[PDB]
Each structure stands twice: as structure tokens, then as C-alpha cells.
């Protein structure tokens with residue numbers, strides 16, 4: 001019993017974290033095989049950040065301008081290239097701790113674990129979701145750039161996020177490991193803002209199923225609804241639309257608890273229109289949207305890595 | 306910016322998790338140097354759990370009755386002894402992945418990371434607090450026994466908890482790594498219940514200071530309180546008493562934000578009286594009590 005915001009075990013990723021220094025800036029790099037990946041903004045000064053020409057700034061750097069430290073060992077940089085907003089530093093040593101990995105680009109609503117790092121040293125691990133507005137509500141201080149997000153699917157680490165920046169509202173923006181930003185953000189010191197965010201409906205439903213599995217049923221009711229009627233309610237309360245794909249994905253949880261997806265939608269509809277009336281669900285007074293249907297099944301079944 | 310419930314990176318502990326089997330029972334063990342630590346109830350059958358005599362059950366076991374698996378490698382048990390509610394299995398191989406470590410017994414209100422495991426394999430990591438009633442609100446299924454709680458301040462792993470059982474309310478009970486239970490619990494199937502749980506006041510205050518550090522001040526008020534008047538009110542909401550030790554501990558956060566501890570206590574008293582009025586604090590509609598003053602300074 002119990003339901004916690006749970007991150008994947010971070011060990012496989014900890015063995016990949018390195019410190020990357022370029023001039024006065026120190027941030028984190030991800031060392032996989034003989035390549036260290038890091039945000040391309042490591043090469044910028046504060047003035048360069050105002051309007052950077054990364055190709056021009058990079059052509060002025062030599063391999064020896066990048067100092068890479070793996071623990072207390074300096075790696076020698078033997079090549080450098082840029083792929084979108086990520087810098088790839090070729091090193092002379094393949095990381096002996098390189099796990100089985102893939103680079104995956106996730107969709108809004110998908111969750112992942114973040115291994116927050118400073119000076120190439122892991123400091124903490126937490127779970128978060130890619131918001132519908134493409135930001136992540138992370139916890140990052142100066143020096144955290146290059147920290148990564150990931151999932152583990154069997155014995156394979158799927159890297160999905162690299163930290164690049166903090167927006168003025170305190171939320172975060174980054175890229176996939178191919179350097180493509182999530183959201184309409186750019187790696188430049190210019191006016192940028194997170195768009196209006198919405199609630200990840202399928203994840204709220206998954207969390208309500210987790211609450212039922214954990215013995216919290218007060219919010220259940222005799223009613224059902226249609227996908228069309230529920231989507232009118234979802235739009236009204238700034239909830240993401242629920243698709244037939246989301247309904248299908250929630251099938252297993254619906255079968256286990258005996259509550260149809262549209263039956264759970266009628267519980268959610270009532271919660272949106274009336275609130276919790278002083279009650280809580282899984283120790284929360286808010287509807288939680290950072291657990292996917294897969295996270296709920298995984299946690300409630302004890303899948304290991 | 307941002308404030309998350311953050312666990313320590315679990316790698317150092319993942320390299321210590323092993324599977325321990327005794328007869329039909331399988332659970333997790335913690336392999337440090339040449340010793341595997343695990344709950345002593347691994348030697349019990351379902352019929353032994355009401356009134357087990359662990360000394361009598363253990364004397365009947367030999368080293369070869371304990372099968373320890375570390376990844377795909379079987380470790381050879383060359384000795385066994387019981388220390389309180391933990392079984393210590395001496396093995397013929399020192400764990401090459403043994404981190405720098407210590408065993409620490411924590412007090413209620415302290416937080417720690419839990420690396421939940423099944424069959425010696427880590428499944429997930431989450432952050433917990435030792436509740437005032439000595440339970441932990443974990444997330445553990447059958448087979449999670451032997452999973453550990455720890456902190457990793459300054460590269461040294463401080464092991465503080467080993468999971469032993471789930472109480473009828475769904476909360477969890479365990480021991481320190483010397484096998485001493487936290488709370489009045491026993492590793493027996495007898496009727497046991499968690500005592501009335503209370504809110505960890507010093508941690509709620511630490512989290513309000515985290516909210517102020519992160520830019521939120523809506524809950525602040527022009528009032529202060531005496532420590533005794535604060536406790537008289539807070540106890541009416543099932544909050545733990547705030548001691549002068551807690552006030553001293555909050556000194557650094559008070560100095561950083563410019564809000565005196567008793568001034569923050571007056572904000573807390575008002576929050577208890579009014580609720581949040583549709584507002585949130587650090588993304589929560591409830592007062593959070595599983596961040597210590599130390600956690601707040603570490604994260605902010």
C-alpha cells in the first residue's frame with residue numbers, strides 16, 4: 001500500500017554525469033560512449049547570450065577550451081560539434097559505465113525522472129512531467145544546466161531531457177538529447193514566457209485509479225458520461241482533451257478496479273464542478289496530474305530495473 | 306527556482322541491493338563489505354509469524370539455508386547472526402560497490418530517501434519522513450521487505466531505515482540498521498496499530514520559509530506569537546509541539562528571509578485557522594511537513 005511520487009533508480013545515469021567547463025562557465029555533461037553531451041550555451045559569455053551566433057562562437061574554440069571532469073579524472077576532448085542546441089564533445093575514453101540507452105523525444109503529459117546535478121555531481125532525483133505548455137516544473141539552481149531527464153523501460157535508459165534554462169515564472173525549459181527544445185523556447189537571453197498551462201487529464205484519471213487501488217473511493221459515483229460531454233467539461237476547466245487513445249490506455253486500470261473510464265470521468269467532472277469538499281485523495285487537496293497510466297500500473301505492480 | 310520533493314540519487318544504494326531467500330520466503334538484503342543485512346523475519350513461515358521465537362528458529366538454520374543472489378551471481382553465506390530484528394549474513398565476497406557509509410538512527414520528523422526493491426532489484430526511489438508516531442507513509446508491496454532508507458549528505462551514505470512491515474492502515478514500520486524498531490512495533494503478526502499521527506510542525510515552518518525564499522509571501526501577517534501560545538493553538542490541529550530546539554534550528558532560515566521564527570509561527574496559526582482560500586503554497590493546497598529545515602537549505 002501507499003502511493004508516492006516515485007523516480008526511477010538513478011544509478012545508471014549517475015555513472016554518466018560529468019562536469020563541463022568552458023572559460024568561466026561550469027555546467028553538467030552526459031558522457032555516453034566517447035561523447036559528452038551538454039547545452040551549447042556553455043560557450044557563451046553573458047553578452048554572447050543576448051544574441052548568440054553559436055557557429056561563430058564555436059569556431060573560435062579549440063578542444064582544449066573544454067575541460068571535462070569525470071569524478072576526479074580529467075577527460076581529454078578530441079573533437080567538438082553542435083547538433084541543434086546541444087554540444088557534443090568527443091573524448092578519448094569511452095565511458096565504461098555507459099548503460100544500454102536510447103534518446104527519445106517525449107510528448108506533453110509524459111513523466112520522467114530528473115537527476116539534478118551541479119559540477120558534474122548528482123545532487124537529487126525527482127519525478128516530473130512535461131507540461132502541456134512544454135515546460136517542466138523542476139527544481140534547479142544556477143549550475144544545474146546539463147542535468148538530464150530519463151525513463152527506464154526494461155534495462156534501457158531512455159534519455160528524454162537535458163536542462164537548459166529557467167523561465168521568469170520559475171519553470172524550466174530544455175531539449176531532447178538531439179538538442180531540439182521542448183516548446184517554443186530559444187537558448188538566448190531574450191524575453192520568453194511559459195504559455196498558459198493546462199491539466200493533464202489522462203494522468204489525473206490514472207491517479208484517481210491509483211487512489212481507488214489504495215482504498216480511497218469517496219469520489220466514486222453511480223454516474224457515467226460520454227467522451228463528448230466530458231470533453232466539454234475538460235475544456236471549461238482548462239483540462240487537456242481526453243482522446244479515445246487515453247481511454248484505451250486506461251483500460252487495464254478500469255478492468256482492475258471495475259470502474260469504467262467514462263465512469264471515472266463522471267467522478268472527475270463532479271470533482272471539477274464541486275471541489276473536494278474538505279476531503280483529500282492520496283493525501284492531496286488538488287487533483288494530481290504528474291502520474292501517467294503506466295506509472296500507476298508500474299508502482300502498483302512493483303516493476304524492477 | 307522550484308521546490309520539489311527530492312530524493313538522493315540512489316546509485317550508491319542500488320549497488321548494495323541483493324535478494325535473500327530462506328526456504329519459501331524471498332526478500333531484499335543490503336550487502337555492505339562482507340555482510341548482508343536483512344529483516345530477521347525472512348526465517349519465518351506464515352505459521353511462525355504470530356509468536357516467533359527467532360533465537361529458536363535461527364539456531365535450526367545453517368549457512369546453506371540462506372541463498373543470497375547479487376545480480377546473476379550467488380554469494381556464499383559463511384556465517385549468520387542476529388542483531389535485534391536484523392539478520393546479518395556473513396558472505397565470502399566483499400561488495401566491490403560498497404560506498405562510504407554509516408548507520409544512523411533518526412528521530413521523528415527526519416526525512417530520508419527510500420529505494421523500494423523487489424527480488425533484490427530496485428524499482429523506484431522516493432522521499433519519506435519518519436512520522437511522529439514512528440511509522441513511514443511509504444509505497445511498498447509484498448516482497449519490499451529489506452528495502453532501505455538513507456541520506457547521502459557529503460558522498461557518505463547514512464543508512465537509517467530497513468523496511469519490515471505494513472500496518473493495517475497501510476503505513477509502514479521498520480528498524481534502523483542495528484535492527485531496533487522505530488516505534489512500539491514488533492516483527493510479529495499480533496494486533497498492532499499506528500498511534501494518532503500528528504503534523505511535523507518544524508518541517509511545516511521550514512517549508513513556509515522555502516515558500517518565502519522562492520518569492521511567495523501571501524500567507525505572512527503583521528502578527529507574532531509567544532512559543533507557548535503557538536503550541537496551545539497548534540496542538541488543537543494535531544500539530545507536534547514546537548520546542549526551543551526547533552526554534553533554534555530555524556534560525557538560519559529566519560536570518561535569510563528576515564522573518565523571525567515566532568512571526569512565521571503566527572503565519573502558520575493563521576493558515577490553520579483560515580485554510581488557503583483557494584491559494585497554493587509551492588504547488589500544494591495542504592501544508593507540507595516532509596521537508597526538514599536542513600532539506601530546505603540544501604534545496605533552496
Ligand SMILES: O=C(Cc1cccc(Cl)n1)Nc1cncc2ccccc12
Pocket residue numbers: 041049140141142143144145164165166167186187188189190306
Ligand atoms: O537559465 C539559465 C541560463 C540561461 C539564460 C538564458 C538563456 C539560456 Cl539557454 N540559459 N540557467 C539556469 C537554469 N536553471 C535554473 C537557474 C536558476 C537560476 C539561474 C540560472 C538558472
Ligand SMILES: O=C(Cc1cccc(Cl)n1)Nc1cncc2ccccc12
Pocket residue numbers: 001346354445446447448449450469470471472477491492493494495
Ligand atoms: O508486512 C509484511 C510482512 C510482515 C512482517 C512482519 C510481521 C508481519 Cl505479520 N508481516 N510485508 C509487507 C511489507 N510492506 C508492504 C506490504 C504490502 C502488502 C503485503 C505485505 C507487505
